[PDB]
Design an enzyme around this catalytic site. Sequence first.
Site, short mmCIF file in Angstrom:
data_model
loop_
_atom_site.label_atom_id
_atom_site.label_comp_id
_atom_site.label_asym_id
_atom_site.label_seq_id
_atom_site.Cartn_x
_atom_site.Cartn_y
_atom_site.Cartn_z
CD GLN A 50 0.37 11.89 5.80
OE1 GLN A 50 0.21 12.61 4.90
NE2 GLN A 50 -0.72 11.67 6.68
CG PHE A 51 6.02 10.11 5.62
CD1 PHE A 51 5.59 9.33 6.77
CD2 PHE A 51 5.78 11.30 5.71
CE1 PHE A 51 5.52 9.84 7.97
CE2 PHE A 51 5.45 12.08 6.99
CZ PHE A 51 5.10 11.21 8.16
CE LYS A 80 4.88 3.08 7.37
NZ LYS A 80 4.35 3.70 8.42
N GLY A 137 0.69 -1.14 -0.05
CA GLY A 137 0.02 -0.16 0.11
C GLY A 137 0.87 1.31 -0.07
CB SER A 138 0.25 4.48 -0.93
OG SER A 138 0.47 4.01 -2.06
CB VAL A 180 4.19 0.36 3.07
CG1 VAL A 180 4.46 -0.85 4.12
CG2 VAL A 180 3.65 1.57 3.91
CG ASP A 206 -0.42 11.28 15.31
OD1 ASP A 206 -1.56 11.73 15.84
OD2 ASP A 206 -0.13 11.22 14.22
N1 LIG Z 1 -0.03 -6.87 6.66
C1 LIG Z 1 0.36 -5.47 6.52
O1 LIG Z 1 -0.53 -4.76 5.93
N2 LIG Z 1 1.29 -4.84 7.18
C2 LIG Z 1 1.69 -3.48 7.45
C3 LIG Z 1 0.80 -2.44 7.01
N3 LIG Z 1 1.58 -1.43 7.58
C4 LIG Z 1 1.40 -0.06 7.33
C5 LIG Z 1 1.50 0.97 8.26
C6 LIG Z 1 1.15 2.35 8.47
C7 LIG Z 1 0.35 2.71 7.08
C8 LIG Z 1 0.48 1.83 5.92
C9 LIG Z 1 -0.01 2.39 4.60
C10 LIG Z 1 -0.16 1.50 3.69
C11 LIG Z 1 0.24 0.33 3.54
C12 LIG Z 1 0.75 -0.30 4.70
C13 LIG Z 1 0.93 0.56 6.09
N4 LIG Z 1 2.57 -1.72 8.47
C14 LIG Z 1 2.72 -3.11 8.30
C15 LIG Z 1 3.57 -3.86 9.06
N5 LIG Z 1 4.54 -3.37 9.91
O2 LIG Z 1 3.70 -4.98 8.84
#
Ligand SMILES: NC(=O)Nc1cn(-c2cccc3ccccc23)nc1C(N)=O
Length: 263
Positions: A18-19, A36, A15-16, A22, A127
């Site tokens: 904030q910055f 990220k 996915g996408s 991913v 946050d």
């Molecule tokens: N299975 C998942 O979608 N895992 C994850 C999704 N993310 C995300 C964290 C914060 C914002 C996101 C935005 C878009 C996609 C993944 C994100 N982090 C993980 C992680 N650390 O595994």
Amino acid sequence: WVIDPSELTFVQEIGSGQFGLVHLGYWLNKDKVAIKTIREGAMSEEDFIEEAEVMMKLSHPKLVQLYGVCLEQAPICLVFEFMEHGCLSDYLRTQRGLFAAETLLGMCLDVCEGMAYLEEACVIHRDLAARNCLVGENQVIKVSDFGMTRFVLDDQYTSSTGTKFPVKWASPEVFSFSRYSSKSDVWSFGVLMWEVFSEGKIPYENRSNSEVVEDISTGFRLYKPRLASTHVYQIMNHCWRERPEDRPAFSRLLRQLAEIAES
Ligand SMILES: NC(=O)Nc1cn(-c2cccc3ccccc23)nc1C(N)=O
Ligand SMILES: NC(=O)Nc1cn(-c2cccc3ccccc23)nc1C(N)=O
């Protein structure tokens, strides 16, 4: 704490953020990871790298582990522990109507355990929200992104007067003076509990930022979600006391929430 680019492989986009993007990937001889990518100009990279020596030592079962930073060339990327079920906010919305009250309280307890560790460590999240919590194996919830707003370069997000400021989770001393403490995290935690018991509803959807500030300053509070018991709602209201000194510490909340779960 630097990861060489030859030690990382990108498998698929998840996915996408904030910055930037991913990705799901692998870290050589270590584990499966979430990577990220951070857009140039989005964060104070030099300030961030400077604090790694102390911050990278933070470790707890209820905190998402940051493994390291890949900074050989721009854009840089942060390498994290992979969380199979993604963000808590999305997970609540997708599974809405399938949750037992005990599961929702258990999610709040996991977040509270992670926050009690950060409180003891003298680390302020700044946050805390369901969007910053992740869901792992067997629905475990872990906290992520603690202290990251200290490095964000977008004034519209970080300034209390900014157009994108997360006012919905802000205590009065945060929205008025950017006065952060473990007590302002407690206020945010109360809002997180409301997001959890409402199964991913957005708080104050029918109000603008200024209307939220005016409502909170005149004593108005979020209504009790259907799935929250009166005892759980009492705890939420304790997190929302106007004076920071009157709010319970995370060590106190953890004991109170654990008593409710068992009984
Ligand atoms: N299975 C998942 O979608 N895992 C994850 C999704 N993310 C995300 C964290 C914060 C914002 C996101 C935005 C878009 C996609 C993944 C994100 N982090 C993980 C992680 N650390 O595994
Ligand atoms: N999921 C996360 O955001 N994890 C983490 C974020 N951080 C950090 C927070 C704030 C400033 C930092 C500066 C440098 C390195 C890690 C930092 N440390 C961890 C950790 N030790 O796991």
